[PDB]
Amino acid sequence: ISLIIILPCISWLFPLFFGRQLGYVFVTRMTSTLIIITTLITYYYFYQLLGNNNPINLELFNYLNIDYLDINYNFEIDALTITMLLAITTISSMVHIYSIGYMETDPHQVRFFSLLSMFTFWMIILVTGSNYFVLFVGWEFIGVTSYLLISFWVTRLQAMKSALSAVLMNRFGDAFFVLGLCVIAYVFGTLNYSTIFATAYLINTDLLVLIMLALFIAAMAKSAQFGLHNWLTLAMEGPTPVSSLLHAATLVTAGIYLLLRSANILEYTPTVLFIILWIGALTTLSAGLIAICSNDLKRIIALSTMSQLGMMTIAIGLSAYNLALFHLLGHAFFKALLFMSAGSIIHSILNESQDIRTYGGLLSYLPYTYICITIASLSLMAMPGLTGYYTKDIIIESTYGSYSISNYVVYWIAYLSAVLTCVYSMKILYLTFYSNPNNNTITYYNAHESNIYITLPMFILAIFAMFAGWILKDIGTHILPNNFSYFDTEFSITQFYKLLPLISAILVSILIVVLNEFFAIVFNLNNKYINTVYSIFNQKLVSDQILNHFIIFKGLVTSGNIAHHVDKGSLYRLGPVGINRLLNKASYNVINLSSNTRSSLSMNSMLILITIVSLLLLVLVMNVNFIIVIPVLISILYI
Amino acid sequence: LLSSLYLFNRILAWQGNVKHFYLFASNLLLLFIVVLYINFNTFSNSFQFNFELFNSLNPFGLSNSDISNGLLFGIDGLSLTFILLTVLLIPLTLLGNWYNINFNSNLYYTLVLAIGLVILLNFWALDYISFYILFEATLPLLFILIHIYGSSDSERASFYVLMFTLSGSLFMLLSIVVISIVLNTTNFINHNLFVLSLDLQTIIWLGLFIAIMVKTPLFPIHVWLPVVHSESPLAGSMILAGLILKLALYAILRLLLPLLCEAQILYTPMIYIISLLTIILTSLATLRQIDLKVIIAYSSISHMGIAILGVCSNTSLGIYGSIVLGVAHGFVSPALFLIVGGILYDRYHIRIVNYYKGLTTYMPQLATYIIILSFANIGTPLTGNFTGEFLSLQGGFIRNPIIGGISCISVLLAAIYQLKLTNKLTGGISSIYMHRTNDVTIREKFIMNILIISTLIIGICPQIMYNLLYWTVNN
Amino acid sequence: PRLLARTLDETRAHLYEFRHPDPIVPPSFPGGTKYERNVPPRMEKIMQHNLYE
Amino acid sequence: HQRPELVSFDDINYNDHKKVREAQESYTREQFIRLEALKTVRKALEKCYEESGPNHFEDCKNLAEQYLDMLPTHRLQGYLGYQRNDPSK
C-alpha cells in the first residue's frame, strides 16, 4: 500500500492542508512531519532498490492524443531519478525543520512553509516525471513559484525587483526549452523518455544540434551558466532557507537534470558537448573571481554553487555523468549545511548583517556553528577525509581523461577553480572566526544565544557530509547509464599523472594554509593600489560586470518603447484620417465660395461652364492616349 | 406548442413591476446555459452539421420546411465548442457587473444580453450571407455601449470601432459578393467543393484576409483594440464580450477551409510574417504604457497572434491548439479584465499604474487571485492556456521552422507583460491610495473563481466535440 | 581660496579614485539588507466604495 | 461498435451529398486507423525498450525501422485534389 504515489501525493497534501489553513502556527508541526514521512519512505524505496524494478505510474491520466503523440501523466522512478529525489527530500525536510524556530515572527508566517512545501511538491514531480511534458510542468512551476517565493517579502529592491530578474532569466531558458520541445515533436513522436532513448538511430543520423543546444540554453539559464548567471546573486536576497533551496538541491540543480534525462542524445552529439565543456569551464573561473571579491557571505556561498556545478557541466561534457550525478548529490549535501549555518550566524547577531567585514568572532564567542561550517568547508575544499575527496578529484581526473584531446587545458581550469574554491572557505572562515572582533555592536555577548535546536537540522546533514562518502561509491557500476562506448572514464580512473593526481589536494592544503597565514601578515587586503589592484577588485566585485546586462535590458526597453513610438506612427495612419480629411473639408468648402451668401448664381454658372469645358476636353484627352491620367489626379490635388 | 414563450413574454411584461429588469435578464441566460447544455448531448459523430433551422423562410416568415431553401440556414456543427465557450460566459459578464450598474438606465443589461445572443447566432450561422448578417450586427450595440456608459473621451473611443471593424467588415463584403456571384450559393456547411481556380481564388483570399486582419488584429491596424479596451464601459461587457467578439478566429477556421484548398501561395509569405512581428512588436509595446487595461489588451493581441499561426499550420495539432486557445484565452483574459474593471477600477476610478502600486498589504486574497491568473496569462505550466500556444507553436514550427524559431520568444514576451506588471503591483507601500475596501465582493469572488476553475479544468484536454482535422488540411 | 579650492577638488577627485562598489550598509539604512523585511502596515479604516457593496 | 462502409471518395460525381459526407467520414476514419496502428507501434517500442535495458541493437531496431518509416506518413487527410496541375514543395 506504500506505493510510489505516496512519494508524490503526500507532498501535494502539503499545499492542500495549507490552502484551507486557519492555523496561525501548528502548520510547522504538521507539514514538516508530513515531509519527513515522505523522506523516510523514499529512503525505504532507495533501500528497496536492490532489485531495480521500475514502478511506472502511467494511467494517472492521458493528457492529450490527437495525431502521432500521446502525452500521459507518466511516472517512472529510475536510478537516475532517485539520486536527485533522495537529495531533495532530505534537503527539503531539513529546511522544514530548520525553518521552524527561525523566521518565527512575521505578518504572515504560514505562507512561507506552505509555499516551500508545495515547491518541494513541484520539484519532486519535476524529477519523477517520465516524459518531457511533465518535466516541463515541474521545470516551469518551480520558477513561477520562485517568483512568489523568493519574493516572500514585499520590500523595494532586494526582493520585488529581484524576483523579476530571477524569473525572467529563467524565462529565457523557458522559451528556448519550448523551442527545443517543438523540434522534439517534429523529429520524434512520443515526446517521452522511453521512445526517445530508442530513437538515437535517426533518419540519416542528422544534425540533432537544435534538439539539444536549445535545451542547453535552459541549462545555461537554469544552473546559472555564464551567459546569464547574475540572477543567483540577485535572488540571493530572499530569506535564507529560500536561498538554501535556491542553491543546494532544488532550483539550480534541474539544469543538470534535464541534461541527465537527456543523456542518450548527448552521447550522439559531440558538437554540443564541446560547448557544454567550455561554458562551464568559463563559469568556474568567473564564480571563483566574483566570490573572491564580493563581501556578502550569501553571495560567497551562492557563487560557490555555480563554481561547484561548472565542473559538473564539464563532467557531462566529458561523458562521465555518473560522476556529475554523484557530485550533484554531494554538492546538495554541502550547501544544505553551509546555508543554514550562515543563516544561524546571521540570526544570532543582533544587527543581522549579511556582510563579512563586521563579524570578528566565530571563535568560542560562538563556537558550535563554526565547527559545523568547518566540517562543511573542509567538505568544500575536496579534503581527503570525507566525500569532498569523492565529489571532486574524480571530475578533475576526468578533465585529464584522455579519450578526448585538446582536453589538457580544462584540467588546469578546474585546478584553478579548486584553488579558488579553497580560498572561498578560508576567506570566510578567517574573517568570521579567527579575525579580531570587527563590529563592537552586540558587544557583551549579546549574540551568545545560539538559535533553537537548529543543531538537529545541521547535525544530520553533517553526518551526510562526513560519512556519507563511504556510502554511494559510484565511479565499475551500473546505475542506469547510456554510455555510447566513447570514453567511459576507465582510462581516467587508471593511472593519470601522479604529479597531477596528487597535486590537486596538496595545492589545496597549501592555499588553505596560505590564506590562514594572512592573519600573521596583513598585506593581501592592504596596499591600496589604485592603478592596478583597486580597479581590479572593483571590476571583479560587480559580478565580472554582469551589469552589462543593464546595457542589454535597460538599453533595449528604450527600443521596446521606440516600438511604442512606431505604434503611434500607426495612429499617424489614423490621426490624419481625422486630420487630412479635416483639411480636405476646408479645401472642398473653400472652392466655389467667393461670395457664397449673395451672388451665388455667378459661381455656379462659371462652374458649370468649367464642367462642360473640362469634361468635353477630357473626353478628347481620353480617346487619344488613355494613359494620361493626371487630369483627374490634379483634380484630387484640390480636395 | 407555439405560444409557450409569448405567454412567458407576458410574464416579462408583468415582470416590470419590480422595476430592475435585471434578475429576469440574468435568469434568462441562466436558462440558456441549460438550453445549450442539453444541446451538447447530441453532436455525437459523423462530422456533419447536426441540427438545422432555416429562419429566413423562403416560403414562410418563421419556419423551416421547403424544397427551394432560399433562407439563412442557421444551425450547429463542430462550432459548438465556441458555443460552449459562450453560454457559460454570458451570465458571467452580468454577474460581474451586477452592482456597479451606474444608474443612468437599465437597458445596458439589454444591450449586453442582446450581443450575447447575437454572437451565439454568429456561431450558429452557416452561410456567408448568414455569417455576415450577424458578424457586424453586434457593432451598433457596441457603439451605443461605448458611447454612453464609457469613462474617458467616448467620442474618441467609440468611433474607432465603427471605423475599423466596420472597415475590414465591408472589405469582407467584397469577397462575400464575389463568391456569392461565382457560386450563386453560399451554404458553407454544404460546400467544401469548388473548381475555383487560382488567381481568382487569390483576390477573394485577400478580401477575406484583411477583414480578419482587422478583427483579430495584426500590425496593420492593431490600435483598433486597446483604446476600445482603454475606455472600457461598465465591467461586465466593457471588455468581455468585445473580447469574445475577437473570436473571429471562428471565421478563419469556418471559412478559408472550404474554398481555399489552394492558398499556399499566400500562406507562408504573408500570414506568418504578419503574425510573427505582431508577437514581437505589439507584445513588446507593453513596457512604458501606463494604463492598466492596455497592457492586457496587448496581451490579448499577442495570444490571438499565436493562435492564428496555429490556424494556418495545415496540421491538426495546430488547429486543435488554436481552438483550445480560443476557449482558453476566452477564459483567462475575461477574468483579468473583470479584475481590473469590476473590483479594481470601481475601488479607485483610475486606471494608471504610477500611483497605483502597492497591494497584498490591505487586499490579501486579491493578490492571490492576481498572480496565478497572470501566470495563466503568462503561458502557465498547466492548462490555463499552455497546450494552446504549445500546439500552436508546434504547428507553426512544422509548417515553417524558422519563423517558429523566432516565435518561441512569445513566452519571454508574455512574461514581459505580467511580471513587469505584478511586482510593481504588489510592492508593499501603497502610499497614494487610502486603503480602499474589501477585495472580494463575495460575488466578484464567484465570477473570478468560475473562470479560474474553468481555465484550470482544461488540464485533461477535452477534444470530444472536435474531429479536429475534419476539413482543414492539404495533401 | 584658489589653492584651497584646488586642493579640495583634487582630494575630491582622489576620493573618486577610491570609490567602493560594496559599502558597509548598516541594516536599518536604505542600503537594503534589513531595509523593510516586513513593513509594519499602518491601520486605517476601510472605505466601502459601492452603495450596494 | 459500428462500422460504416467506406465509399471510395474519388468515384461518385459530387452531388449526392450524403455519399460525399460518408466518403470523407470514411477517409478520416481510415486516417485514424493508420494512426492507431502507429500508436500500436509506439506501445510495442516502449515495451521492447524497457525489457531491453541496454539492448537497443538486439530486437528493438526492427521496430524503429518501420517506426521512423511510418511517422512521416499516416498524419493528414486533406482532399483528393482534382487534377494536380501545378506542383510546388
Task: For the beta carbon of residue A24, count every other beta carbon within 10 angstroms.
Answer: 9
* CB burial readout A179-192, b (16+ within 10 A) else e: bbbbbbbebbbbbb
Q: Which of A68, A197, A200 sits opposite D38 (nearest CB)?
A: A68
Q: Is A52 on the interface with D (CB under 8 A)?
A: no
Domain ranges of chain D: 1-89
Q: For the purposes of burial, counting CB atoms within 10 Å of the CB of B244, is it exposed (0-12), middle (13-18) or buried (19 or more)? A: buried
B428/C36 touch (CB, cutoff 8 Å), yes or no: yes
A538/C21 touch (CB, cutoff 8 Å), yes or no: yes
Contact predicate A182/A122, CB 8 Å: no
Task: For the beta carbon of residue A543, count every other beta carbon within 10 angstroms.
Answer: 24
Cell numbers 520539484 correspond to A123
Return residues 26-65 of D near B (CB < 8 Å): 28, 31
Chain C interface, best mutation among B95, B350, B436, by max C CB count within 10 A: B436
- The span from the CA of B441 to the CA of B365, in Å, is 11
Domain ranges of chain B: 1-475
**DSSP, residue by residue, A217-266:** HHHHHTTT-TTS-HHHHHHTTS-HHHHHHHHTTSTTTHHHHHHHTTHHHH
Q: For the purposes of burial, counting CB atoms within 10 Å of the CB of D2, is it exposed (0-12), middle (13-18) or buried (19 or more)? A: exposed
D64/A192 touch (CB, cutoff 8 Å), yes or no: no
Cell numbers 534525462 correspond to A261
Query: For chain B, how far is it from start to end, CA to CA, in angstroms?
Result: 50
- The span from the CA of B448 to the CA of A6, in Å, is 33
Contact predicate A227/A99, CB 8 Å: no
H-only helix segments in D1-89: 17-52, 61-70
Give chains near B: 3+ CB pairs under 8 A. Answer: A, C, D
CA distance C8 to chain A (A): 19
Task: For the beta carbon of residue D32, count every other beta carbon within 10 angstroms.
Answer: 14
Contact predicate A297/A310, CB 8 Å: no
Q: Which amino acid is at A295?
A: N
**DSSP, residue by residue, B368-418:** HHHHHHHHHHHT-SSTTTTHHHHHHHHHHHHH-HHHHHHHTTHHHHHHHHH
Query: For chain A, how far is it from start to end, CA to CA, in angstroms?
Result: 86
Contact predicate D48/A198, CB 8 Å: yes
Give D-chain residues touching A205 at CB under 8 angstroms.
none
Resolution of the PDB structure in angstroms: 4.3
Q: Is D46 on the interface with A (CB under 8 A)?
A: yes
Contact predicate B100/C50, CB 8 Å: yes
Cell of A170: 529563467
A171/B411 touch (CB, cutoff 8 Å), yes or no: yes
Q: Which amino acid is at A22?
A: L
Q: Which amino acid is at A126?
A: L
- The span from the CA of A330 to the CA of A489, in Å, is 20
Cell numbers 524497457 correspond to D50
Angle subtended by helix axes A455-466 and A321-348, to nearest 10: 150
- Nearest alpha carbon to residue C32 among A543, A160, A297, A145: A160
- The span from the CA of B242 to the CA of B240, in Å, is 5
Beta bridge partners of B291: B352
Q: Is C30 on the interface with B (CB under 8 A)?
A: no
Contact predicate A250/A200, CB 8 Å: no
Cell of A146: 520562485
Cell of B468: 479536429
H-only helix segments in A54-159: 79-96, 110-128, 133-150
Q: Which amino acid is at A107?
A: P
A155/C21 touch (CB, cutoff 8 Å), yes or no: no
Q: What does the angle CA A530 – CA A534 – CA A540 come to, to the nearest 5 degrees?
A: 150
Method by which the coordinates were obtained: cryo-EM
For A484, nearest residue in chain D (alpha carbons): D54
Q: What is the dihedral of CA A544, A549, A550, A554, to 10 degrees?
A: 180
A294/C22 touch (CB, cutoff 8 Å), yes or no: yes
A182-188 CB contacts, 8 Å cutoff, 24+ apart? A182/B393, A182/B394, A182/B397, A182/B404, A182/B408, A183/A210, A183/A211, A183/A214, A183/B397, A183/B401, A184/A132, A184/A211, A185/A69, A185/B394, A186/B394, A186/B397, A186/B398, A186/B401, A187/A211
Tell me whether strands A75-76 and A71-72 are parallel, antiparallel or unpaired: unpaired
A67/B317 touch (CB, cutoff 8 Å), yes or no: yes
Distances, alpha carbon B286 to alpha carbons B18, B304, B330, in Å: 46, 16, 20
Contact predicate B183/B201, CB 8 Å: no
Contact predicate B222/B228, CB 8 Å: no
- The span from the CA of A323 to the CA of A316, in Å, is 8
Contact predicate A396/A280, CB 8 Å: no
Give B-chain residues touching D35 at CB under 8 angstroms.
none
- Nearest alpha carbon to residue B96 among B37, B158, B26: B26
- Nearest alpha carbon to residue A543 among A355, A245, A310, A306: A306
What's B329-344 look like in SS3? HHHHHHHHHHHHHHCC
For A155, nearest residue in chain B (alpha carbons): B428
- C-alpha dihedral sign at A502, A504, A505, A508: positive
CA distance B269 to chain C (A): 52
Contact predicate A102/A255, CB 8 Å: no
Contact predicate B246/B304, CB 8 Å: yes
Q: Do chains A and C touch (3 or more CB pairs under 8 A)?
A: yes
- The span from the CA of A68 to the CA of D76, in Å, is 11
- The span from the CA of D51 to the CA of D64, in Å, is 15
A567/B285 touch (CB, cutoff 8 Å), yes or no: yes
B463/A66 touch (CB, cutoff 8 Å), yes or no: yes
Cell numbers 483550445 correspond to B324
- Nearest alpha carbon to residue A225 among A143, A323, A332, A303: A303
Cell of A324: 556529475
Q: Is B259 on the interface with D (CB under 8 A)?
A: no
Chain B interface, best mutation among C35, C38, C44, C50, by max B CB count within 10 A: C50
Give A256's contacts (C-beta < 8 A, 6+ positions apart): A219, A223, A309, A312, A313, A316, A324, A328
* CB burial readout A10-20, b (16+ within 10 A) else e: bbbbbbebbee
For A236, nearest residue in chain C (alpha carbons): C33
DSSP helix/strand/coil, A147? helix
Cell of A267: 552521447
Backbone angles phi, psi at A192, to 5 degrees: -130, -160
Q: What does the angle CA B58 – CA B61 – CA B62 come to, to the nearest 5 degrees?
A: 105
B475/D21 touch (CB, cutoff 8 Å), yes or no: no
Contact predicate A393/A315, CB 8 Å: no
Give B364's contacts (C-beta < 8 A, 6+ positions apart): B439
Beta bridge partners of A57: A75
Count CA atoms closer than 13 A to A42's CA, side-chain side.
30
Tell me whether strands A75-76 and A56-57 are parallel, antiparallel or unpaired: antiparallel
User: How many residues can be counted in chain C?
Assistant: 53
Q: Which amino acid is at D23?
A: A
Cell numbers 553526518 correspond to A463
- The span from the CA of B322 to the CA of B325, in Å, is 5
Q: Which of A67, A195, A201 sits opposite D42 (nearest CB)?
A: A195
Return residues 49-108 of B near A (CB < 8 Å): none
Cell numbers 510593481 correspond to B424
For A170, nearest residue in chain B (alpha carbons): B412
Q: Which of A141, A154, A571 sits opposite B427 (nearest CB)?
A: A154
B291: DSSP letter: B
For D48, nearest residue in chain A (alpha carbons): A198
Q: For the purposes of burial, counting CB atoms within 10 Å of the CB of B152, is it exposed (0-12), middle (13-18) or buried (19 or more)? A: middle
- The span from the CA of A218 to the CA of A364, in Å, is 45
Task: For the beta carbon of residue B5, count every other beta carbon within 10 angstroms.
Answer: 11
- The span from the CA of A177 to the CA of A218, in Å, is 6
- The span from the CA of D49 to the CA of A198, in Å, is 7
Q: Which amino acid is at D2?
A: Q
Q: Is B166 on the interface with A (CB under 8 A)?
A: no
Beta bridge partners of A75: A57, A129
DSSP helix/strand/coil, B82? helix
Backbone angles phi, psi at B90, to 5 degrees: -65, -45
Task: For the beta carbon of residue B241, count every other beta carbon within 10 angstroms.
Answer: 25
Q: Which of C39, C46, C53 sits opposite B435 (nearest CB)?
A: C46
Give A-chain residues touching B410 at CB under 8 angstroms.
175
Give B-chain residues touching C36 at CB under 8 angstroms.
428
Distances, alpha carbon B364 to alpha carbons B7, B58, B342, B437, B448, in Å: 49, 60, 17, 11, 15
- Nearest alpha carbon to residue A290 among A273, A276, A272, A304: A304
Distances, alpha carbon B118 to alpha carbons A567, B74, B98, in Å: 32, 12, 21
Contact predicate A260/A252, CB 8 Å: no
Q: What does the angle CA A85 – CA A90 – CA A94 come to, to the nearest 5 degrees?
A: 150
- The span from the CA of D89 to the CA of D71, in Å, is 19
C24/A357 touch (CB, cutoff 8 Å), yes or no: yes
* CB burial readout A277-296, b (16+ within 10 A) else e: bbbbbbbbbbbbbbbbbbbb
Cell of A461: 546533514
Task: For the beta carbon of residue B264, count every other beta carbon within 10 angstroms.
Answer: 15
Query: For chain D, how far is it from start to end, CA to CA, in angstroms?
Result: 40
The secondary structure element, H or E, covering residue A76 is strand A75-76
- The span from the CA of A507 to the CA of A419, in Å, is 7
- The span from the CA of A164 to the CA of B425, in Å, is 12
Q: Is B382 on the interface with A (CB under 8 A)?
A: yes
- The span from the CA of A396 to the CA of A332, in Å, is 19
Cell of B270: 504573408
Give chains near A: 3+ CB pairs under 8 A. Answer: B, C, D
Task: For the beta carbon of residue A554, count every other beta carbon within 10 angstroms.
Answer: 10
**Chain center to CA of B206:** 23
Q: Which amino acid is at C18?
A: F
Contact predicate A210/A272, CB 8 Å: no
- Nearest alpha carbon to residue B420 among B328, B283, B307: B283
**DSSP, residue by residue, A406-470:** S-HHHHHHHHHHHHHHHHHHHHHHIIIIIS-----TTTTTTT-S--SSTHHHHHHHHHHHHSSSS
- The span from the CA of A28 to the CA of D24, in Å, is 62
Contact predicate B326/B247, CB 8 Å: yes
Cell numbers 483574459 correspond to B333
- Nearest alpha carbon to residue A8 among A43, A42, A44: A42
- The span from the CA of D73 to the CA of D67, in Å, is 10
Q: What does the angle CA A415 – CA A418 – CA A424 come to, to the nearest 5 degrees?
A: 145
Contact predicate A75/A57, CB 8 Å: yes
**Chain center to CA of A488:** 29
